[PDB]
C-alpha cells in the first residue's frame, strides 16, 4: 500500500481486502496491464487495486496461490499442486478470468 512497492493492496468489493508482495504477485497477467498501465513509474505505487465481485476467501486463495506460484516457479521445486476446495473453484474460475493466468 506504501509507495515503496513491495506491498500492494488489492480489494474485491469485500471488507477483507488483501495486501501482498508485488514480487510474489509478479506472475499476474494483468499486473502488466493495469498496474503497468499506459505509463509505468508511480502508476504501480498507488496500490489501490479495486476489483469487484470476488468473495474474500476466494481471492485469499488466489493471492496465496500468487505467492505459491512465484516461489514454486523457477525454484528448485516444480512438482507441487494447489489444493482448492471443489465448490469455490467455480467462483475461483471467475478469478481465472481476471488475472490472465
Amino acid at each position: 500500500e506504501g509507495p515503496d512497492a513491495m506491498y500492494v493492496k488489492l480489494i474485491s468489493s469485500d471488507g477483507h481486502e488483501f495486501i501482498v508482495k508485488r514480487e510474489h504477485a509478479l506472475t499476474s497477467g494483468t499486473i502488466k496491464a493495469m498496474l503497468s498501465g499506459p505509463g509505468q513509474f508511480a502508476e504501480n505505487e498507488t496500490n489501490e487495486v479495486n476489483f469487484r465481485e470476488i468473495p474474500s476467501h476466494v481471492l485469499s486463495k488466489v493471492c496465496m496461490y500468487f505467492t505459491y506460484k512465484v516461489r514454486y516457479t523457477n525454484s528448485s521445486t516444480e512438482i507441487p499442486e494447489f489444493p482448492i476446495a471443489p465448490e469455490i473453484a467455480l467462483e475461483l474460475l471467475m478469478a481465472a478470468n481476471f488475472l490472465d493466468c
Binding site: 499442486e81 494447489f82 473453484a89 478470468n97
Partner: protein, 95 residues
C-alpha cells in the same frame, strides 16, 4: 504429479476430476468452461444444461463430439441442433 500448473489449469483439472460436483455455474462463460465440458458424458451435460440453461446455445457443438461417438452412422437434418437430435435419437433408441 511432476507438473507445474497455472490457475486455469489447476481449476480445470480439479473440476475435470469432479464434474459431478457442479450444480450451478453462476456466470462463467463457456469459453472458460470449454475444457471441463469436453471431458464429460452426455447425462452430465443434460444435468448441467438443465440447471444452467443459459449455456445451452453455446454447448451444441460439444454435443457433436458425443453424437459421432454414440450415433456415428448419423448426420443431423436441417433445423436440428445436435442437442435435440441426441435427445431424440437417445429416447427413440431407449423406446
Amino acid at each position: 504429479l511432476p507438473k507445474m500448473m497455472t490457475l486455469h489449469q489447476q481449476c480445470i483439472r480439479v473440476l475435470k476430476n469432479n464434474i459431478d460436483s457442479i450444480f450451478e455455474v453462476g456466470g462463467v462463460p463457456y469459453s472458460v468452461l470449454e475444457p471441463v465440458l469436453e471431458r464429460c458424458t452426455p447425462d452430465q451435460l443434460y444435468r448441467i444444461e438443465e440447471y444452467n440453461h443459459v449455456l445451452i446455445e453455446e454447448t451444441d457443438q460439444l454435443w457433436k463430439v458425443h453424437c459421432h461417438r454414440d450415433f456415428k452412422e448419423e448426420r443431423p437434418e436441417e433445423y436440428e441442433s445436435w442437442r435435440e437430435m441426441y435427445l431424440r435419437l437417445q429416447d427413440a433408441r431407449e423406446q
